[PDB]
Amino acid sequence: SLIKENMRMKVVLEGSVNGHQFKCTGEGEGNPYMGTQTMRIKVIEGGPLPFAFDILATSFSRTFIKYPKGIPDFFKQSFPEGFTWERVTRYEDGGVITVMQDTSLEDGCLVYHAQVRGVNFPSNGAVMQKKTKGWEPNTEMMYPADGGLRGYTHMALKVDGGGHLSCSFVTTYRSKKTVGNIKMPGIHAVSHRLERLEESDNEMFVVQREHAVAKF
């Protein structure tokens, strides 16, 4: 397969949140067939970010989902060309973030480009005040949709003082394949656990890992 048991990734993610422009770069590796990955991320422009890095964390990798025998893997089948994803995330207190992402494969490395735009986060809220504490584990429902997939998520962002902020989104996953076939899965789910491993004081440097497993 073009997707090996060990694969490296690199990412450029840029955009703005509440008018604050930034750019990040990341690089990492994982085992796509075990659904595990780690990435090391630096804020290279606009730092220190005046908002929680957690709102960006889920924008930095669908090739690394452990899919059983019996659920077709849309993502791995999309190579060499790869896939795109487009997401809007809506937070219960009115933040909205739109993300556009491209996934390519270049010289044996997965290459990601993401653009993000967040607006209307309350200035006083946990995101803009940097009072968040990571994401609860969650399950994304995956639906077949006219040759692509729609993912649907309700996630809980932990906040200081024993709170959460709920958010939801729909993701549209599209293949870039111009030659060849894709076997489409049926409805399924993907269980995620996204963990912050390292961070610097002002989140200029973050290391995170994910474990993602598909199920019926």
Author numbering: 3 to 62, 66 to 221
What's in the article?
GECIs are prominent tools to monitor [Ca2+] in defined cells and intra-cellular compartments. High-resolution crystal structures of mRuby in several states, as well as a structure of a Ca2+-loaded RCaMP variant, aided optimization of the red GECI scaffold to useful performance levels.
Structural information on the parent protein of mRuby, eqFP611 (86% sequence identity with mRuby), has been published, however, no protein structure of mRuby was available at the time of initial RCaMP engineering, hampering optimization efforts. The large difference in pH had no notable effect on overall mRuby protein structure (RMSD = 0.13 Å for 208 Cα atoms). Similar pH-dependent cis-trans conformational changes also occur in the related FP eqFP578 (70% sequence identity with mRuby). Crystal structures of mRuby at low and high pH revealed a cis-trans chromophore isomerization in acidic environments. In contrast with the chromophore in the structure of mRuby crystallized at pH 8.5, the RCaMP structure (crystallized at pH 7.5) shows the (4-hydroxybenzylidene)-imidazol-5-one moiety of the chromophore to be a cis-isomer.
